[model samples]
Each structure stands twice: as structure tokens, then as C-alpha cells.
Target chain A: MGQNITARIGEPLVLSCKGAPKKPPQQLEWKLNTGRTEAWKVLSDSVARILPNGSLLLPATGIVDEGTFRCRATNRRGKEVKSNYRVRVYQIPGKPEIVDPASELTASVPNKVGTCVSEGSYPAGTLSWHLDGKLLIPDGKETLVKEETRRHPETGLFTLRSELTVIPGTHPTFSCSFSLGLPRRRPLNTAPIQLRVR
Target chain B: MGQNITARIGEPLVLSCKGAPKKPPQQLEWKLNTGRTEAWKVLSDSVARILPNGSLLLPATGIVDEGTFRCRATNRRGKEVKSNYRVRVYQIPGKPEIVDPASELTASVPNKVGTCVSEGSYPAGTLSWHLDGKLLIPDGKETLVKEETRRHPETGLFTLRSELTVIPGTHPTFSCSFSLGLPRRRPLNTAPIQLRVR
Candidate 1:
């Protein structure tokens, strides 16, 4: 039975197969069923090796390599059997990008309401601001002004919002970027917004 | 009715209560109703300068400072009103830690079978591992690893399974931490398992 062999793009995967016989196999061969690069090549012509159970060993495991793999086992009687395992790869959502307010600008003294908006589609998308190319998470100075998400019968739209209030003399050049994959992945960055204080 | 005040231990918190006064020169004082001196205190000032909206403000709140808070307001005309609000400071859970046999110890072998399990309890509890203190959240980790969440009638449990291979003697330490909540809390670094090569 084939289970837990599928994987995402840029992931390590392992494919394994084993069978019983009256006598242990002298040789075994592993072939990439889908024409993908082999994970490893053995010095012996046969891929069969010694298993911890003393039967036959053929373990194909690696990261960054993915695809269908097949194992062929041949015993002392020239008996042969084959089995195939499929590998599937899917693209992870990209890091989100910060939109709206475009990083930086200037506003009048009486009415200074700067709005910064960002949008991206990752399983988890987040946007953060930075002052002078350095990240600046939302603090007391800023608030998420608005948020709207509309899922169409077919297509969907997601939106995010942030607003800031600073005295006319206090200004900061800020940048915002967001990431999609698990938190550690490289976040897709947005253009910087430079706030010019007059 | 007060809604904009909350606090927690270790980190920072803020609490504010409203005093009734349509006019001026009101006496505003603060006290810990529960009297847990070791738990909390007024970081800033007990009697904060009254705001036009009849509210007293605490700048930085923290844990051990959780409980009922009372603010009494008195006007020049002797008309006084007292307001009471409850403040419950929650304890932040420590970082996540792994408690498994396979992955932690037998990690020197490149392609060995190892099983890892981690546990933690918090409103936002997640278990994960790191390599050299950095998060190893890429494909090799999340794919083969299995996860299970169990909430006991008393002790909540968050558990996950992952497979790890040893490489270059750089034994990476896994950490379990919360990914939710404001001010990005730290994770638990459970006692790590040392590798033993066969």
C-alpha cells in the first residue's frame, strides 16, 4: 500500500518497499518511475542492500528531490517483483505584499491620518511596517484601521488595513512586508513608504 | 462598564477605569481590591491625573497585577461615585519543549528512523523544533511529522510528531512556543535530547 509518500515542492521525501521470499535477494534495483533525478546511486549494480531485519534494504530518502519511484527486487531464483510509488509536489503560497500608503508621504498638520494597507495570499499572510527599511510592528502609534474579506462563489478577495497618527514634526520613513509560508520563510517584501515631515 | 483594560505577567499591561464627573477637580485614587501584593502593583501612579472623559489610566500593566481595581472620584460639590472593575492577569506559558526518544538522541546517522513528540498547554499552544536554535519549519519537518491536539478537562495538550536525521554533529535544539497574541511571546525550550551515535 502507498501512503504518506506525497510532498510539497522543495521538500525532502522518502519512498520504500519490501517483500518476502524463501531466500534473501542477492540484488535489487531502484528506478525513478517519473524520469526525475535519482536521489542516490549505489556503487553496486543492484540497489538491494542489507536491511536491519536481514531481508533486503532499499530506502530512497532525500530533500529537494521529489517524484514517483519504483523498486525492483530479484532473488537467487531470478524471481522479480516491482512496485511503484507516486510523488506529488504543490507550490506554497507566496509571501504577502504591503499595499496602500506606499511606505511614505506628507500630510498637513490639522488633519494627519496616514493609512497603510497591505495584501498578499499565503496560507497565513501578514503585513508589518518598518521605519527606514527596518521592520516596525504595530504599536500604540498605529492601529489596524479596517479589514474586509469577500469570498465570491468562484473568486475571493482579502484586504488588510493600518492607520498611524504622528505630530506634524514627528515623521518616520517606513517599510512594510509580508510572508505567506510558515513564519520562517522569506517574506515577500513591498516598496518602502517615506514619510516627509514638513 | 470598562472594556479597554487588560494585563499579563512578565510582559506589559495597561488598565483604566472611568470615574463619574460632568465637572472639575475630582479626587481619583486606585487600590488593589484582592490585595495580592506579590502578584501586581501600580507601575505608574495610583491617582492618575483625571481625563476629560472621567477615566484613569495605567501606562504599563503586568502579571501579578491582576484583580479587581477600584477608582473613587469626588468633586468639589462632595458628589462622589465609585467604580470597580475586575483585572485578571494570565500567566504566559513557557517555551515549547520536545519529549521524544528517537529524534533527540540517535541523530548522527544521516538516514535513520527517529520519532519526536512535543507537548505544551496555553490558549495558543504550538509544538515545533529548531536547528541550532533557528526554526527548521521547511518541508522535511512538516511533511512526515504527524500532529494531534487533545484538550483535557483540566490540562490542555498540544502534541506533534516529526522525523529528524543527524548531520555534521550540529545538534539543533527544538522549541515549542506560541505563535499567536500581541507582543510576540517567547517559546518553551524543553530539555533537549543529546545524540548518541551507534
Candidate 2:
């Protein structure tokens, strides 16, 4: 079986279905599950091409193809093997925002806490903080971090919250960034938080 | 690709994924999709077993297992194939209630519409009417019928509304019933609507 594949909308995706014996399959078929009553249906070669080597080539992936895929094969003796793959297509989300950063991160205090939130993202993204262009690691002692994610009931979008607690004198400027995907990209960044100390 | 299977809660389900050139698979994996950020996860062999013939045997199904499943297979040469199956496990809904059956079917009316509603049911049941023990088909000329189903945003339960329009004096007794599943069972029956025709 192949691992789940995540693709951006309008991108091309290829799903490999290599059955046992490491040889060419006598007969192969592909199907999809859309989580509906009439869920399963055979893939049309026109839309999804079945290559000679038991793989499916989706020329251009779309939201309609965002579901679980199945590949079935048969041997000469009528015996069979099978594999499954999940294809998720997502779009980039809007930038994140800091919730009352100025008031929450006031200086002169021993410790202060501030929150950053990102909403309306398909797959939840990671939230992190940086001070004066330096990454602030979430070490329990000095810099503390708490993160929570909630999925929308109607839409499958996600909302992420990240809280950071740090000593007031650490940095004058703090930045929060939200990233998604492997080799993550920071598409959403909050305005810098300027601290005031006595 | 195989068909998506729908089973009742607490029932046993078997998913078939047959691949060709049968031989011992180098690696076989199963995953489930639960509408989460990291939706898919590897399935333990204890909860679900992959048969030697490339089929999955689920001892009993529950609401948690009601999602899309992917079965992946890999051969010695690193060839792979994937198959997906959607499982829908639902509970039987309680009987329906006729809202104000008396006033809806009053006398001295040429054409009238009476409605029956069934709420808090999973996989909404179908609603039909019978006049004096005779099945009343939802035809337009003598009898007209309109049915609507709405699913709850969070619970996924269904609310079914079925309307029946008839020219009074057709039948003295009108009954509405709600049913679900194959070999259709009517779990809820409304009180008879005694029609007083002029």
C-alpha cells in the first residue's frame, strides 16, 4: 500500500499501487470513496489514467478528487492484492493575527503571556515565535508554549491558537508565524509586538 | 476498487481489496480518515486483520470506525498499490410523530396538505402515508407528496419532513410511517389522521 499523498489544488498527483510478486498485474482496477451513500465508483481512464505498471496518474488534481483511492489487481489464478491511498487537496490560508499583543506582553513584569491565532485553514498549521529575528525555542523554564487546534463543524477548516509566555526583558520585538506542509512555508505572519518597559 | 459498505452499529463488516500476482506482501498497511488535520493513521492488526487473500475483516463496527479506510500493499521490488473503503455505521432512529394530526385533516376543504416529521434519526428514514390501510402513493393528480431531509451540523442526525396533499373524502383514515434500512422496518408510526369530509 502507498502512503497518503497531500497535493495542492490544481497540481498533478501520481499514486502508485504496487501489488505483491513485484511483477506486472494481469488485471488492475481503481476506485474512489467520497464519504457519501453512493461512495465507491470505478475510475474512468479519461479522468484518471491507469498506467501499464499499476499506478494512477491524475493529470490535474481538484477538490472533487480529494478522497480515498483504492487500487485492486488480479493474478492469473484469479488471486488478488490491494492497496489504498488518501488524497487531500488544500488551499493556502490567510495570514494569522496577534490577539491584543500590546496589552498582553507588557514589559517590567517577571513573566508575560501573549496569544496568536490563525483561522480558516484546511489543514492546521504550526505556530511559533521569534524574538528580534532569533527563534525562541519552547524551553519550559524561560520560554513556555501552549498550542490548541479546533476544527469547524460545518466546514472542515481549522483554527489554531498558540500562547507564549516569556520574561519581559527578553526581546523588544516579537514575531509570530504560522506555517503548513512539509518543508513548511510561513504564509501567515503576525504584526511585530513592541514591548514597553519601565 | 471495491464498493463502499454501509453497516448498522454493532454489526460485522468485511472489506475486500484484491490485487493481482498474488504473493506474500513485503509490507501491508491500513489507515483511517476521521476528518482531522492528520486524518489518516496506520491501523493496528489487532483491531483490524488483513487476510492472506488481501481482504480486511472487521469483527464489529462502531461510530468511530465510520470513515474512509485505505489498504496499502508493497512488494519485494517496492511496487505498491492502494485501495480505499468507506464504512458508514448508523443507529436506528426512533419512531416518528404526527404534528397535530386532527387539525391538519379537517373537513370542507377541496385540497389540503398534511405533514409528518421524524427527528433525531441517523441516516434519515423514508416517510410514506397510507389511507384506510391502503398504500397512498405520492402521485400528483389525486395525491401529492413532498419530502425533505436535513442533517444536523454537529451530530449528523437527520430530520425528515414528508408532506401529503389529498382531496378530502378519499379516505376516512390516514396514517404516516417512518422506516429505515433494508427489509425496511417501520420503527415509528404516527396516530391516524381521522378525516371528516363534508
Candidate 3:
């Protein structure tokens, strides 16, 4: 396996040759290996661009641009060294949808009241729960934030949901956030679902 | 325990009582118990209608129509018998969605090519795959038709998926349906995903 790089669709994918086998070279060239073993020398096209110092930047990566890349260097004596990179891309499932039960909460009683769901993301994804601006985790008992990350057996996509079971009090501000792979953090946020005590 | 019944929103629900106790009934009535022990008598209204044999017919059931019902009858011998029915209603998650990867199929070889999914149905639900008048199967070998049934621990609603693996060589059209009861109908059918032989 080569240095595998992963990114979300349309996110910036930066690839630069740190160096040739730790050698000093007069010329550095960035090439793309599109599974044909042929070299597509990088240029300033809409797909990607060649950065200064023999680097490449995919400003908006698409599935078609998913493949391995090579950076080759040549020294004064015609000596050569290179590095290869594998880039795999994924997609965001969708916006996070929250469902807050209409039933009123009870004081000092643990109530399982709400849920948040996000689905159809390749390479799966994740859900994070926050209450009063604090992250929640399982407490071995009532104050539990349980989550299920389901993978579609064929598509290999994911569906994620996190449930909130808490001992009720006053207005508890609960919210959920979703994420996928990227150099940039691609997160979908949801409005808070607050519950009232009975 | 009572006669607990469950249905999805906007489905036909036909309820009829057999009769009173040992003796023949002289009169019968259908009344709904909306949490309270008090009765809301059944009549011709937008929600439900009175049937000929002292029964009830809900042409389109909604969450608002969820409650328990009491069918009380008085016999000619001045004795009475009663039967209670409970109805809980849930909504269909949404229309089912399909995802078929762009990869072409190979001849005489089993390829896992497509997936069908439906989500957010209460009391869970199911997915059935079909192709050219035949139900695809998992032969425990290469003919693998697989599925995942996920339940949200808090909401108890379900998300279902079925993946199709087949030996390809056709302009074959495949489809998936989502259902929560009401099996005699087409249920919620998604747009077909077609695959081609390479």
C-alpha cells in the first residue's frame, strides 16, 4: 500500500513532493498515474493545478480524479527519484435530521426523548451529541448518549443515529453534529432540541 | 393486556367485533377510549365511519386516530359483553431510495452491484428485492443477497437495506420495495436501477 490520501468531494486535496528519495534535484515534475501506467503531467486545468516547487493541488476533487499520483525528480547527473500517492474520495451523506418527541420530560426521571439521524455517506460517517455545549458519552446508566453506525452491506455507505436518554430537569439544550472525511472539516449541524419538564 | 393493534399512517384499518358473550346480542356500539376511560362514540365522520354490522372502518388512519376502542353489546337476556381494541399508528419514513454504482457487470460472474434502502419506519419494516419475475437470493455462495435491519435504540424506528449480488449477462432491471405491513399491495416501490453486461 502507498501513502493513501482520503478527501471528501469538492474539498481541497493538497499533494506536494516533500523531496525525491531525500536527494537534491534540478527539476521536479508532478505526474498522475490513472491506472494505465501512463503519465498525465500536471497542468493548470479545471481539474487540478501544478503548484510551485513541483506540487499538485486539487481545488475541487471529483470521483473521476480518484487515482494514484506520482512526483518525479531528476538530478544533474540524470539520476531519478519519485514518490507515489493514492487518493480516494468520498461524499457527504446529507444534513442531519433531528426528532424530538413531543412528550414532556419528568423531573428526576430518566427519559429517552430524542434522536438524530444522518445517512447515505460513503466510507461511512459519524455523529456527535452535545448538551449545554458539552459533549455527551455513556455513563453506564441513565445519562447515556448511545449511537448506532450502520453500514449498507452492498454500497458500503453508512447511516448514523445517536439517542439521548437523560434524567430530566429544566430546559436541556441538546444538539447533534455530523462529519465525513476531508482535509477540511465537513460537518452538518442541527438546531438544538430542548425539552420541558412536566 | 388488551387487543393491541398497530398500523402505519394513511392505511386502511377495518375493525369488527364478532359478537357479545354466550347469548345473542340485541344492540352493539363502538366507542374510542382516548387515554381517558370516557368514550367517544363511533359515527360517520372524517376520521372513521360506522359499518353495517356494528363495526368501524377507518378509511385513512392518522396518528391523531391512535387510541383504544371498546365494543360494548347488550344481549336479550339483559347481560352484556365487551371487547376492547387498541390502535397505535406510525408514519411511513419516506419514499425508498436506491443507489447503484456505475461499475458495469461482468458476464458469467457474480458481482455485487446495487443496494436498496428505506429508513425511519416505526416498529421496523422490511425490504424485498426483485428482478425480471424472480426473487434474488443468497445461495450462501456467490449468489449472495444480503440485508441489514437497524433499529434506533431510542426511537425504536427502523432502517432497512437489501443488497443484490448476481451473475450478470443481461439488460436486467432490478427493483426494491419498502413496506410496513399491507403486503398485498405494491407498497413503496423505488425507481429501478438497471445494470449492463461488460
Candidate 2 at A11: error in angstroms?
41
Off by over 4 Å in 3: A1-6, A10-68, A71-77, A86-93, A120-125, A152-157, A179-198, B1-198
> lDDT for every model?
0.43, 0.64, 0.65
Q: How do the residues A1-198 of candidate 1 rate in per-residue lDDT, one tens digit apiece?
A: 453254433222334345423223335656553323545443210132333212322222222233445666664456766656655433333344444443444454322345555442313344555567876544443333333433222222234455544433466565555543344333345745999999
- When only chain A is evaluated, what TM-score does every model earn? 0.34, 0.55, 0.52
Instruction: Give the DockQ (C-alpha) for candidate 2.
Output: 0.01
Expressed as tens digits, the lDDT of each residue in B52-159 for candidate 2 is 445565544556676778887764456877777766667666577776445556445535556798886766668888777777876556668778999888766788
- The DockQ for candidate 3, computed on C-alphas, is 0.00
Give candidates' CA RMSD values in order.
28.5, 20.6, 30.5
User: Lowest summed lDDT over 10 consecutive residues: which window, candidate 2 chain B?
Assistant: B17-26
The superposed Cα distance between candidate 3 and the true structure at residue A156, in angstroms, equals: 4.8
lDDT tens per residue, model 3, B1-198: 437677765454656555532222237777785533355755324356544444565655655566777787764456666777878877577588887753787888788877888887764667777777576656766567788989776655678887888765558777777767534322344745999999
Candidate number that wins on TM-score, 2 or 3: 2
Candidate 3 local lDDT, A1-198, one digit each (tens): 437877655444657564532222247777785533355755323456544334565545556566778887764456776778888778778789887754787878788868889987765667878878887777866687778889876655678888888775467776788866454433444745999999
Against the true two-chain complex, what DockQ does each candidate achieve? 0.01, 0.01, 0.00
Which portions of model 2 miss their true places by more than 4 Å? A1-198, B1-3, B10-26, B34-39, B43-67, B74-84, B88-91, B103-106, B110-114, B120-122, B133-148, B163-166, B179-198
